[PDB]
Write a protein that binds this ligand. Structure first.
Ligand code: MYA
Ligand code: 31A
Ligand code: MG
Length: 374
């Protein structure tokens, strides 16, 4: 039973869904007053353009955000990463929803929405993406998370949006898809010394996972300003084969792919004709070693039309290694299963569940999920 989630417009777990549409009607009359927090706590919309406020959020998440199943690593999203992730085109200040202690002003809670146009089967809907739900460790198991969720819902409803997309490691009613975490060792000595990885020699293991010093695909180079239109084109066309995807404007494409050091890398393949035919991309997200830092790259969007996908991703691994990353991480979504085993990815523990709020539709396999979040 789900004390919070049974009250929400989402399908029941183990409801075979054969329909397509919203769970409830669009509200045409929205609660104007913030939801009531427990005594001693108050809402505060966080201005991330104020360096002090950004730092406070960084610290909250640094000290209180997601850990792995073994509680040995915690994601360490940087200030600059958070600005990229939370100020894309159409970001709204009121959707950076903090909770503060009244007496001290200490930041103890967060949740965020960013707008996104989502393609789900035969339907394209303006939605939001919910990320960075975080309650301080000392406030855990006090039902603050439902208040954070209800409040962002209200604030999103005020802007005329009635659906959301989100992911979590926990099972809630009801996943649209389920992904699996895969990791590719780049610096196996560090991964073993930090206990990320564990009848093999260390000699043998370094040999197994050794990569070329430079990439193999002809005409690979960083994405530049001039590539924004064609990257947009490649991504728009490539994504049509999946059943859950973003629909990005050209400005959105600039935001999410244009390289920024230690945040996002995108490389394009420009062939012998001067035509851009493929791209790869990965984002930067380290983890604090509890139980100093583990440098990890996360596979983002990888589009292929002329270069085989295996080669693209092989080049992605080489570039990640050149840039000092200890490990390259990917999900089993899109066509990722075609290369994961072949490029010596190992499977992880944990599931990433994909979810829609206020949208009833059939579930899909991971291979039909075409949406990658931060
Ligand atoms: C139209 C617009 C709609 C927009 C809204 C769309 C929905 C957005 C939904 C959110 C998308 C988030 C996307 C991400 O960022 S996923 C990452 C979430 N953050 C973390 O995992 C960081 C570490 N953990 C924490 O900070 C806390 O443990 C959190 C904040 C997770 C829960 O705090 P706490 O441990 O103190 O619990 P509680 O007593 O307050 O509340 C217990 C209730 O909350 C349910 N719960 C637990 N974990 C999650 C979870 N990850 N998504 C949704 N619900 C969750 C739980 O089943 C129970 O409900 P029920 O079992 O009684 O029903
Ligand atoms: C060692 O460092 C850490 C620290 C905390 C948790 C984890 C496990 C984990 N939850 N991984 C992913 O969600 C994940 C795995 C593969 C690819 C992408 C992954 O996550 C994305 C970035 C974080 N939000 C979910 C998507 C590892
Ligand atoms: Mg709580």
């Amino acid at each position: 039973s789900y004390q919070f989630w049974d009250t929400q417009p989402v399908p029941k777990l183990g409801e075979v869904v054969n329909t397509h549409g919203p769970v409830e009607p669009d509200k045409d009359n929205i609660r104007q007053e913030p939801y009531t927090l427990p005594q001693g706590f108050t809402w505060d919309a966080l201005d991330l353009g104020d360096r002090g406020v950004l730092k406070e959020l960084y610290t909250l998440l640094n000290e209180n955000y997601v850990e792995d199943d073994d509680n040995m690593f915690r994601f360490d999203y940087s200030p600059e990463f958070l600005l990229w992730a939370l100020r894309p085109p159409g970001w709204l200040p009121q959707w950076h929803c903090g909770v503060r202690v009244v007496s001290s002003r200490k930041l103890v809670g967060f949740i965020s929405a960013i707008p996104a146009n989502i393609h789900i089967y035969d339907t394209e809907k303006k939605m939001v993406e919910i990320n960075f739900l975080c309650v301080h460790k000392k406030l855990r198991s006090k039902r603050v998370a439902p208040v954070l969720i209800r409040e962002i819902t209200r604030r999103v409803h005020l802007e005329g949006i009635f659906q959301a997309v989100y992911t979590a490691g926990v099972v809630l009613p009801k996943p649209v898809g389920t992904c699996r975490y895969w990791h590719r060792s780049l610096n196996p000595r560090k991964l073993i010394e930090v206990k990320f990885s564990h009848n093999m020699t260390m000699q043998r293991t370094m040999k197994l996972y050794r990569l070329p010093e430079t990439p193999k695909t002809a005409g690979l180079r960083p994405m530049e300003t001039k590539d924004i239109p064609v990257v947009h084109q490649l991504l728009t066309r490539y994504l049509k084969q999946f059943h859950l995807t973003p629909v990005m404007s050209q400005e959105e494409v600039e935001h999410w792919f244009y390289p920024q050091e230690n945040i996002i890398d995108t490389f394009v393949v420009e062939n012998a004709n001067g035509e851009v035919t493929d791209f790869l991309s990965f984002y930067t997200l380290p983890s604090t070693i509890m139980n100093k830092s583990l440098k990890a790259a996360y596979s983002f969007y990888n589009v292929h039309t002329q270069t085989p996908l295996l080669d693209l991703m092989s080049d992605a691994l080489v570039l990640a290694k050149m840039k000092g990353f200890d490990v390259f991480n990917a999900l089993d979504l899109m066509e990722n299963k075609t290369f994961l085993e072949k490029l010596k990815f190992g499977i992880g523990d944990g599931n990433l569940q994909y979810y829609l709020y206020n949208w009833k539709c059939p579930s899909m396999g991971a291979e039909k999920v075409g949406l990658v979040l931060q």
